[PDB]
Every structure is written in C-alpha cells, then in structure tokens.
Amino acid sequence: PIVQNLQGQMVHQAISPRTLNAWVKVVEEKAFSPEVIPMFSALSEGATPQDLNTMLNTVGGHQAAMQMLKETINEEAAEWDRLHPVHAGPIAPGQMREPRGSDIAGTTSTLQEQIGWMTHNPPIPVGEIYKRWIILGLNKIVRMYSPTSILDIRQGPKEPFRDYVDRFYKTLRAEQASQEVKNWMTETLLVQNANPDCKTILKALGPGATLEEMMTACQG
Amino acid sequence: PIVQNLQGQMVHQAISPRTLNAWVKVVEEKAFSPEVIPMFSALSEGATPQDLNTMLNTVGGHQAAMQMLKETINEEAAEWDRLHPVHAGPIAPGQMREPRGSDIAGTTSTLQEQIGWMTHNPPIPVGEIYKRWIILGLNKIVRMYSPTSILDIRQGPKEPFRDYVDRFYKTLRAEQASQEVKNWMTETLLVQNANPDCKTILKALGPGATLEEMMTACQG
C-alpha cells in the first residue's frame, strides 16, 4: 500500500505478498470471529481504495458477504452523494474535486486520482470513509453469521463456568447493543443462567460482586 | 520487478522467488476461481513484459489452458499489429522503435529492451496492455473451468439458502454479464430459484427488500 518516505511525503508502493498471504490465511482459518475486525484496521492503514477493492476481491468463497458489503457501499455512496454538495466548474490544476460514490468505490477512479486525493490540501481521506463503510459491513455480517443469541446461553450441570462465561462474553461482544444494556445483561444474565449451586453462592455474595470473586467461589 | 524506490526514482529489480512460489502454490492448490484474477494483478504491478512471460511460464500442469492463453496472446498481438501501422523513422538515442506483436508479449524481446521501452519518453506501458490481454483470457478460462450453468441452479428442498446464494454468486462472478445485467439477473433468479416456502414468504414481503430480508425471512 502507501508507505511513508524518509523525511518525505506519502508515496504508493506495491502490495506486500506477505500482507495478502496473511489476510487470506486469517480469512480462511476462522473468518467469523470478532477479533478479525481489528485485524482489518491492522492492515488497512493508509491503503488506497484500489487496495481495498483488491483485498475485497482476493477473498475466496462466502460471496454473500461480498454482496452485502457491495450493497452497503452502494447505499452509503448514494447517501454521501446526496448529503455532500455537488462539485463542478474549473478544477484547480494539481488536485481533483471531492470524489463521488463511484470514485471512492474505485470502480471509476484510477490510482493517480487516489494518490492526488491522499496528498490533497486539505487531504481528503476517502480511503478512511471507504474502510469505515467496510467496517460497518463487517459488523452487520458478524451479526448475520452469529449462530446464537445472548439470552439462550445456559450453563450445563457438568459444564465448567470458565468456558461458559467465555462464550457469554463472546456473544456479548457479538451483540450490537448499547453500553448500558451490555452492563445490565452482564450483571443479570451471568447468574440467571448458571449452575444452581454457585448461583446461590453468588446470590449470597451480594450485589455488585466482581467476577473474580464469583470465579473463585464457583470452584468446587 | 520495477518498484518505486524510496526518496528516488523507480528502478528495475529481479523477481523475488517468494512471489513466484506463492503464485505457483496458489495456482496448484486452488481452482480457476474468479478471485485469482485480482491476485495476479496483486503480483504483476510494475512488471516488465519479460517478467509477465516468466510468470506465465512457471505454471505447473493444466497446459491446455496455457495453450488457450498462448492462442489468445497470438491473436491479440495480430490485432495490435493490424491496428498499429508500422512506425518508420530515424533511430536515435532517447527514442525506441514501436514494439510489435512478438515484442509486447516479451517472447522475442530481451529484458533490457523492455527496460528501454519503459524508460522511453513518453512512457509506453504496452507490457501492461499485455497484462490486461492475459486477464481477458483468464476471464474466459474461468468460464471454461466452471462449466456449471447459471440458469439451471436450483435450491434443493434440504439445501440451505446460504450455500445456495454462495454458489449462485460464485457462478455470477464466473459469468461475463455486465453490472446492470448481473443486478437484474440476480434480482430475478434469487427469488425465482428458491424453496417454495421461501418464495411465498419473500413474495409476501414484496420487492424492493435487500438480500438481508431475503435471508432473514425464510430462516429454516
């Protein structure tokens, strides 16, 4: 992608084969865990919209997610076009006007236009907008691909509380609810669906008990 | 290949063995899916025609498709020679003669000649044209190695709609239809080739809903 230059501006460079190999490995090993969402921001720093398009295309299978993200990109491009004032008239030499939905998506914009937009004055980070749209698409796709809800988790009589609370927090992270709702569910459902023995132990522990005390109490 | 040197001008470089090894391993481990076409453009950027020829030559097996690509290269070179009259003029330093059909593919041109063509003023990315030429072939190559039709696709009574839409979009990517034709064909056949209960539910929902409602309407 675009790499920094020693005491210089930002110039475009070829995509590292290591980056794409790591991306295909991580999207072929699990491809449906929340931690792959930060991984995206660990590799899409400063990348051109063309790089985003190539990364989206290089994935194998699961084209339903590709259609989902394409639809979200189209609708958000339309909303950006309607909200942002239209640009016309003589364009200043050396720079280009604010790109429309087609240009930011990379379908009609070449590499030179994206490079000029990155080095604009003031710089226009439409790559950031495109990747935040992709982040929203990833959020909705991980909502889609989550195979369980939050309220249906139940701890088995022989099931340890360790992996129980682990999967509870995994589904909590998969949930898109507000912070206060997350706090309420983590304060209630963590005991509403546990084993009865240490359920009553935690009830005896009183309200607002930290989870370390609960985990040291549910043992045995 | 030719890479943009930091705080300096671009210079020719030898092909890294790792890129070729990754290319050959991904060719031998994966079928002729559409997503391999962008992957090629993720490794052939800033490459001389000789580099592209070497990349083509490292193919392991499936030489029938290689013969198809060679024939398409020959016919495209013939078309290029036919549409470009022979450029006759003085030969002086700083000016290089017009490459022919055997020269764009790099079969009869040395690496130094390609470097001189790249450094010629004005720059001639004719080798890049050759790249797109092979891309064209790769397109039909996919259509050759995914012989399953798109009209005959039908979701079985026990076939989940997730895999149904996955294979439908795989064959769509294998298809040569334009963007609008693809959109129309999907918006028709997705509801035309579903389970009867899904058909009734989605027709009760009505047209205009995105694929999200299509998925969430007839779950199970």
Next chain:
Amino acid sequence: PIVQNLQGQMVHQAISPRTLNAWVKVVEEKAFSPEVIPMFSALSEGATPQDLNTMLNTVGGHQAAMQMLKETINEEAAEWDRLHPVHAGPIAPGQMREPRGSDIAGTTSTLQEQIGWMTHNPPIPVGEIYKRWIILGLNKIVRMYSPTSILDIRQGPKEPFRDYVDRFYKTLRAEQASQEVKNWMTETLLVQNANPDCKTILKALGPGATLEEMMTACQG
C-alpha cells in the same frame, strides 16, 4: 510503533504484520504462563496506546480475562483521574492537556494527540503508564490461571529433586507474593519438602548455602 528516523525527525509508523502474527500465534498456542508476561514487553516497547489496544483486541478466546483486564483498566483510569490534579480552564495554544482516563486507553484519543504527547515538551509517557497497567492486568491474569498454590508442592520419594525445584521456582515466578516473603520462602520451603536423606544432608550442610551446594549435596 514509534521509531527514530536516521538523521531525521521522529516519525510514527504502523505495526508490522510479523510482530502481530507472532504475538497472536504465541498467545493462542502457549497458555497463560508467566513467561508470556515478558514476551509482551518484548514486542510492545515504544508503542502508541492505539497500537496497544489493537494488539489487545486481536487476541481470540479467553474473553473472561479480557473483561477482567478491561475492568482493571477502567478502575485504574478512574483512580488516576481522581488522584491527578486535572487542570481546568483555558489551555495555552501549542500545548496539550493531561491525558484523560479514556485517552490513555486510546478509545477517545486520536493518533495525532498520541504523537503530540510523545513529542511534547516535556514529553508525556502516557503509553508507558498504559503499558504498566497492562502489566498489572497480565499479572492478575496469570494469578487467575495459576494451576495450584505454592505451599502444596511435595517431592516424590523417587522423583528426582531436579524437576521438583524446577516446578517450585516456576510456581514462585507464578506466585502473587511480594519480595520479602518469597525471599524468606526460597530458603526454607525447598529444604523442608524434600526426601528425608537429602533434607538431613542439606541441614548438616548449614544455612546460607546457595542452591548449587544444595543440588550437589542432593545428588545421588
């Protein structure tokens, strides 16, 4: 992370895929053993808080420890906010106010703010404070994942004392005890919970001898 340009000004770079891939693979493979605590500081030196929280988020599984460390980070940030004399009123131009309880976590502080803090006059090592908080959280996590206590280790009648003292010192490294108590216990517990013949040999050898004499006298 943060690097110094050769004969140049300070420049902030991204995270290389090598470091994150190695960290995630070693975390997913190796358990929550004490040796992972130094390993983190091997790869998280001079890193911005945003890089630290992205590295934290890229982990997969064991979300109970993640929730516990988030709680500890939040409470420590609140304590830092209340104890520190939070400046109020106007801020002079060209300055940067003290980090917030959420700015140190990186969830509300932009990368430009982090860069300004790093190069501030005088510099603010907020990233180091966050790293120390992470170190405390990892100590809590390794205490949580401690298999057994330290007083229950018993030497087998025929098991060699070599692996006995090895696991004793491993558990000492995994122990939550302070400095003076561990100094007291490293001179009396090992000679008290060994085979009787070697115990009496060590007792006759005299107190104050280092562990090399202990192991040589205990040789069979």
Next chain:
Amino acid sequence: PIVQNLQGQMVHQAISPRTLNAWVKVVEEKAFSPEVIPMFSALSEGATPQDLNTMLNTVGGHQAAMQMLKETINEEAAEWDRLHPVHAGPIAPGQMREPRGSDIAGTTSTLQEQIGWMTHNPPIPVGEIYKRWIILGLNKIVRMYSPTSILDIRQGPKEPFRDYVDRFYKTLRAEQASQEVKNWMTETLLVQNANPDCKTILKALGPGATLEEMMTACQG
C-alpha cells in the same frame, strides 16, 4: 549475481542463500519436470558462471544427469574452442580477450575475471552462453526422462477428454522435436487418438479448427 547500483556504478552482489535453498528443495521434492527449465532462468538473471556452477553442484540425487550435463558442457566447450580459436597478442589495458573453453565453463576462472569481462565493452556474455549450455543439457535430460513417446498415446473409453488433452500437451511440451512438425501434429493426433464421441463431434465440425472449439465440442 551482479546488480546495478542506486544511481552509481556496477557492483557485484552476494548470492542469496534462500533462492538456492528453494531451488534445491523444489528440485529434490517434486520431480525432474521440464518446468524447472524456464524458472531456472528466473533464478539465474545476471549471474556469473561461478554462481551457476555453485547452483549446479549443490544438487542432491540423480548424479547420472549431472554427469550427462558435464559431458555435454565439455563437448560444447571443445566445439567452441575449435570453431573460435584462442586469441593471442598482448592484452590492452581496459579490455580483455574472450574466455577460453575452460574459462567459459566457470572452472578455471575467478569472480574478478567475470567482473572484468562484464565491465569490458562490449560485454562478453560468458554467463549467458554457459546458461544456454545448461538449458540444452536440461533439455537433453528431460528428453531422457520421458517414459513414453508422443505417437503412442491413446485415450481410455472411460476417461474424460480433459486429462487426455492435458497429458497430450504435457508430452508435446516434453518433446524436443522441431516446432513446425510439433504444431502440425498437435492439430491432428489429438483427434486421431481420441474417444469415439470426440472423434465423431470433431469430424462433424470439419477439418481445421481451434482447440478451444474442439474442447468445448467434446464437452457433454
């Protein structure tokens, strides 16, 4: 090999061990397939005959082919010596006479001699000629390695035409006959030795066609 300087003068570069290790491991792991013939050039660009000799000597297994290629190199060096007699006379400063029969084989010469030959104007392509001789030796080796002829191939009744055409083209590539007769026979023998259904479809198509049409007609 010998690499160009960053806007400077030609400087010899050290041999990368990774390329040699990859070459030897792939040669010893997969096969003695003719696919090594082109990719060898990708690993021997701008390399002195010493580097080629070092690469050749580090091979493992099947020393009979090594003896064959050594004998071919010796006889071709003798041919070069007898066709082009050894030059005599004092060597003017700044130039150097052509390499001898042993010098061109990279045996009785040092790296500095190759550097002086390369910097000499015109540059004598001793390395290129040695590479051509190695290519001819490998062509003879792969001619030997062929376990069957080209005219005895027959297609099984219970086999798809894809494997038949694949093996026909791989054996055609493995052939060392003249290109003219090869291209003449690749349009006839493929149907002269095909299954009856392909034969009937092709003779219904009529004499003369492109292999794309042939292989699409064989489908179904």
Next chain:
Amino acid sequence: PIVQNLQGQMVHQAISPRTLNAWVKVVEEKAFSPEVIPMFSALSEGATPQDLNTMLNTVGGHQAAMQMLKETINEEAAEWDRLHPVHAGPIAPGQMREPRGSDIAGTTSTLQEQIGWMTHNPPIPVGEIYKRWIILGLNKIVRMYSPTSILDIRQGPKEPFRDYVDRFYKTLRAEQASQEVKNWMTETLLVQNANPDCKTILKALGPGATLEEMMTACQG
C-alpha cells in the same frame, strides 16, 4: 538494537520476533549443550542490557538455571562494585559515572541511561561485561548438566569406537578446564579405557600418530 546502517551512523532498533523465537525454540529443543554458548554470542551482537535481559527471560521452564545465573550475576555485580572505585559526588555535565552493579543487569537502569553510556566517550562496554557473565553462567550450568565425568568413560565390548570417541569429545567440550589438560586427556585417556583389540593395535601403532591414523588402524 545497536545495528549499523547503510553508509550511516548506528541507530537504535528492536530485536525481530523471529530471532527471539528461534533462540527460545533452540534452547528448549536441542539441549543445554556447550554449542549453545557460541549461538548466544551469534545473537547477542550489538544488544543492549535490556535486550539481553529480555532474551534471557523469554525462556520457558528450567527456572533453576535461571535462578543460578541470576545469583551469579548478582555476585559478579557485587565483585565489580567492590573492585571498581565507588564514585562519590556528581560529575561535570556531559558525562555520567560508571554504571552500578544493578545497572549492568538493567534492573534499575532504563534504556536511555544505557544508550547514553554507550554513546559516551570513552565508550562503556557494560553489555560486553554482562555477556561474558552470561557466558560464565552458561559454562557452569553446562558443567552442572554433564551426566558423567571424563575419567569413567568405558567403551562397550561390541560398541564401535566411533561412538566412544564422539562421546568422549562431547564430554570433553563440556569440561571447564585448561586447554593443556584437554590435550593431555585426549592424548592419554583415549586408549586407556578402550577395547583390548583397539588397545593392542594402538600400542602397536605407537603414540606418535594422530587420531586419524589410530582410528583407521583398528576399524571394526
């Protein structure tokens, strides 16, 4: 860490994860053999005391050896403090006093102090002192881990003398003694504790021959 730059002054850097991963894996997999002592010196070139401490602490298990080497480091630091003059009072600005016994290990001295000491004129090779202390600790732990002495090695009645001489030399390399003692042992003990037939053949061949002649004398 301390690594030279291309035609430029040395700048601070960080140890690559692959180096530490290889170091820890070879430490945990091969042995606590003397050959690891040079290996460490291969990976400790231009390394700050912080890097040395991190590389030391990244090992998993064998904590008894870690405690032993820490104790030897502490006693060596005490010896250095008592031997080298104890500076009292600050020095003129621009210079710093010699690092304390706790500063060589890096327990109390930060990386900035180590960098300042390294760049100070005259240079402070405190890292070299720490490395040689680690070398002494490795030598003593190798001597500890030797399962047998050099005096009680007996050749098997049917075991070939190749394995006998190999194990004799391997044990000798683990011996911490002068080179003259090693020469005397290799010249005397190699025949004293051998099989009667090789003993008689060795005595017939005389004591003036080298190891090669005597090992080729009584083969079988």
Next chain:
Amino acid sequence: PIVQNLQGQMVHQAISPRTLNAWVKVVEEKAFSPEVIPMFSALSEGATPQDLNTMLNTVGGHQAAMQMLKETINEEAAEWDRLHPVHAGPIAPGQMREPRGSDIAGTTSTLQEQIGWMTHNPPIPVGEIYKRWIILGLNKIVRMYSPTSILDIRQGPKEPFRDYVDRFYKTLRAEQASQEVKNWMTETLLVQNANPDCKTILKALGPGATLEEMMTACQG
C-alpha cells in the same frame, strides 16, 4: 560478514541469523555428502575467520570430525609458520603485519585485527586461506562415512540399472582421486558389474559408450 557497501568503502557486518540457522539445519538434517561442500562455500562467500569458527562451532554431534578438522587446522598453521618465516622490525602505521598460524584461525587475533587485515593494502585474504584449509579437512571427512569401496558395487537381478548407476556415480563423486583414474574406471567397473543381459548388450555396443545410451539400451 564481508558485505560490499553501495559505492563506498569496505564495511564489516555480523553474521545473519538466518544463514547460520540454514547451515545448522542442513548439517543436522542432511548427512555428510559432497554436495554440501559447495553449500558451505556459498554460505561463506566472504567472512572473517572469527565468523568462520563461530559458524563451525554451532554444529552439535559428530565431534570426532570437529577434532579432525581442528587437528588439520593446527597442522596447516604449523606448515604456514614453517614456510613463511616470522618477521620483526618496524611496522608501518595504518597497517598490520601478516597473520601467523594462530592468527589465521582467529584464536588470538581480535575482530579489530581481522577488520584491519580485510581493509589492508594490498588486501589479505587470510580468512579465504583459512576456508581452503577447511576444504582440505572436509575432503578426508568425505572419506569418513564412506561405507564401501569403488569396485565392490554389484547390481542385483531384481535391482533396476538406474539405482545401480546412481550408486556407482555417488561413490565415484564421493571418492577423492585423480582425474585419470576416474576416467579409466568410468568405462570398466560399470559394465563389469552389471546384469548379464544388458552387460552383453553393452559389450556388443563396443567402445565409445556414453551413460545415456548405456542405460537406455539397458531398459527392459
């Protein structure tokens, strides 16, 4: 090691960890074979003697060969001391006297002396000489693990001729002798020790037999 600077002066470098890792892996995995003899030289294309002995001491096991090569190094140092008289008197400033028998091995000379000798005018390839000394030693190392002679090889009736000729050439290449004896034996032993059918075929073929025709006539 010895690395050329970009159009600059000669600058010393430390040994790359990957080079020594590859060396030790190929030594431990692949048995002692002549093919690894070039593998050493490619890994030692310019290095100080200190680096040579450092990479030589990394190998674990087979210490008998290490002792043999150390003895040969000592005897070659004695030879160098005898043939090259020791010189005394004044030493020119900026230059160092020629290395002695102990200095070439690097046992007494420090890294600074090696650097000064590398940059000496005229250059002193003392380390190069050292490497050729090692070559001599490894020659007799080839004689160590040779299990049979060059005339006891026999082709079994059930064993294919390919394996027989492969082993014959392995033993021929491994064996150290003159060129004339190899030329004599490459036409006598192989025919004499072949299965009777193709042996009499070769005898009917007569003189001038080449291995290619030899074992293409032996097919069947």
